[PDB]
Amino acid sequence: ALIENKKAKLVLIANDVDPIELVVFLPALCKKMGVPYAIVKGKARLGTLVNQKTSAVA
Amino acid sequence: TVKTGIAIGLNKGKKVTSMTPAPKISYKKGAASNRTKFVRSLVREIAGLSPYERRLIDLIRNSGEKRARKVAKKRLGSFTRAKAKVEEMNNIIAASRRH
Amino acid sequence: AISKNLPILKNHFRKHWQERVKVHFDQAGKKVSRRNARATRAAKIAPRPLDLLRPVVRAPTVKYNRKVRAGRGFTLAEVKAAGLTAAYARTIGIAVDHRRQNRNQEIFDANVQRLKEYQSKIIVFPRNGKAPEAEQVLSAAATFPIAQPATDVEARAVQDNGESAFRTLRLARSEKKFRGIREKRAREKAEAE
Amino acid sequence: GAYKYLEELQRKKQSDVLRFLQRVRVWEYRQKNVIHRAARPTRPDKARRLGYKAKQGFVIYRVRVRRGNRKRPVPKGATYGKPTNQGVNELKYQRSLRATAEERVGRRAANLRVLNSYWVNQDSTYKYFEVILVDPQHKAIRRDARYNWICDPVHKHREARGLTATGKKSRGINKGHKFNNTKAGRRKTWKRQNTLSLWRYRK
Amino acid sequence: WRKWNVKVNHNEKRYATASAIAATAVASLVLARGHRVEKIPEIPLVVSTDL
Amino acid sequence: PSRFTKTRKHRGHVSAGKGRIGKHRKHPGGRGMAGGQHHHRINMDKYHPGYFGKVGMRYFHKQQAHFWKPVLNLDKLWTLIPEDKRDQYLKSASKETAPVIDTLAAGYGKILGKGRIPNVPVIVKARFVSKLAEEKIRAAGGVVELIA
RNA sequence: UCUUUGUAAAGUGCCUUCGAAGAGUCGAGUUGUUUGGGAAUGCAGCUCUAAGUGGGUGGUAAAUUCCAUCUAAAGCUAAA
RNA sequence: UUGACCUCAAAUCAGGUAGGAGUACCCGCUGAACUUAAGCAUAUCAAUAAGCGGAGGAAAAGAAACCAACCGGGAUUGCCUUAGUAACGGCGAGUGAAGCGGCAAAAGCUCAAAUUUGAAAUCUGGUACCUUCGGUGCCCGAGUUGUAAUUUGGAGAGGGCA
User: Fold this and answer.
1) Where is the composition biased (Basic residues) (chain F)?
2) Is the N or the C terminus of chain C less surrounded, counting Cβ atoms within 10 Å?
3) What is the edge-to-edge ordering of all strands in the sheet holding F143-146?
4) Phi, psi dihedrals of residue C155, rounded to the nearest 5°
């Protein structure tokens, strides 16, 4: 919802998520919206920065 | 559609001072949105065409639309679904490859 | 097995019909128990009627469109026309129907006047503690009866304009019978090159 | 949110991305047991709209059903009856395969109440389903008044009586003139119109 | 499911009830039915509403 | 009652009114309408001609409320005026005070002209009128007003 | 009779921008069963497989044009 | 080397739950033939008996992807009726509803799909205490692949004013 509102300034995307249908639209939408995006190794590493277990996007 | 007051004919039935009631919000289930137009157009660029949709744009270019509606009636359910599919495939070809 | 001048009967008893015979011996018993259920409900619902306020409504299907029947509920436009919201009107004992619409101004005016007449004849006790007990009326259909609307007068002047009514009906049936063919001829002649 | 994108994207089952996912997943589900516990929904919005919520006591079970017609018993194809009842092969089993999936899962985890189930995959032999079940003894379900209706004793084994969505489909329960034989139950309407009602004063 | 109760037309039941009330008059039918009424003054008779 | 029944009169006599040669059996000629074309043909023709066969066209989902049009003849038509006003309106047979007769609310769909209304002018509220019902109503000085 | 819940919650009016509404499902063909349902009432197997001014229905198959009526593929609910 | 995460196990691990009986009525599955057709094979018997799975004091159904063609009605169930009718049927034997209408009883609704984003506000469990069909404090855990609030189409949501 932040990407659709053109409000996010950076989007880190996990590559590990087991249903990939959750996140396959996240590159393309980010190319549509002009939000820069990086696919980064680790949903666990994303979860550590946000005090969850995994977070799958940040 | 005001009625005549007699029992047969075209507009048969009693004359009544009509009211035209409030429109229900159902009867607007078919209205798309600003949102779902954006979602379905962004899934269409990720998913792409189907094996029968990829064949349908070959039949339109190489054999015209009567041969593609005949196929799309066989692929989809009825004929009125084939009309709405071949025009969508005409919206694919005309938008991208020409202009 | 077929012998006399007797009419051909169709008695549908070739199944195991004797296992499904329901004799109603408890007609008197269910009548008494039903009256006792109504008395117990009138005790629990102690100042209120047993029923809700129903609307004047017009029955369908030309066999019955001459008749006015009690309807289900009071159609949020009719509730709003009588100056009260739907959720409150449900608690004041007026039945509300979201499905029924208003296409008829006479039935609309009848149901809104039913609502004004109901509001002018009931008292709602305030919520906390006062409750000045006031002798419940069991039926709301009794106090606010569905009145069949009068359509005309008993005496009038005979106004013979000259034209027939049988020819009016026969021309209406003719005009309906040939509308599509006359439109077809209009399209086939309007295709004048 | 993401669930609209997933809801539209799980409709293009002939596109390349979804058929690659269907091939990989239909291998993987085939490698495991017939009835096995799924740790999370693979279709989280399709599960979510069928009643699932990611709290404790909501369980997903994946299940595998053999496709095709129902071949009759009574050995060597001999039916011993009229020539109309002699058909052994093309008989069709009036319940869905999804209802049989719900039945087998509700039989294995009998302490859980079957909420819904949905299609995920298929190959030639097997159809694949995921069943969402509710735990009626969990205190995250006995409280939370949106969902404690399932803790009533009347919703014991809804999938075995035909009370789920595929069960109310395959029982024919619908409003309409198209559903006159089974609108309030097939046998109930048949018993109602195949009885002789006699009053005290015979009409 | 044998027939136990019997329909009678309501006008016929009222006919029979009126004939019975009319037969509670003159004491030949009352004497012929039982009813030791040989020494009451009238045939049917009333009484004050104090009863 | 069984007391007044001829089974109390065949006590003592052997075959109970069924014959010695005939010997009342279970079903000697079939069951029900069995054999109407073969051994019960002389009963089917002669007392039921027209039983077998098909006539006409089918009507899927026929509703008998579409065809609701009960008829009223010109014979009565004054029974729809009450008796206290019937003698009042029969005399003073004139226009400008004429009885409006609501035949639809009376429960009729069609007026038919079977015969001989009095010469009073009346006002008939109908849906369907025949020819002769309208001619005789107008010959008495009245009109028919078609309603729905 | 005792707490005051609470710088909480709810309902009404006008203007404006919107208004997300359920997919191997709907629907179609075929097969079997069933129905009063008849060019196919319902259900089920297989094959194909949607849309969004859309879809279902309107008891004769089809094409073209209209109209009317609901809002499916998720769920709860006493009483007769 | 260490600490995660995902997935999968193990335990006489802490707490629970299922089986069986009864089954008149109820929800499904599966499913005959005798019989009738004066034979018999479609049909009928019968969408029944037997068999199997599953509930409750009722069950089921249920707030319309309904009925209609009206001046339109309005969740479901049931009775009178429609009606032995429309229709089905070696159009043979036979079968056979539904809409309207009168009545009994009447009751309504909630999720998914919206960013709380200026603060996961939500919840199980453990332990301590207390006023114990539970509450409060503390702490692990669930959970951002989404629990609360808001909204359910009859609408409703966001701004502005009243």
Assistant:
1) 1-13, 20-29
2) C
3) C155-156, F98-102, F123-126, F143-146
4) -135, 140
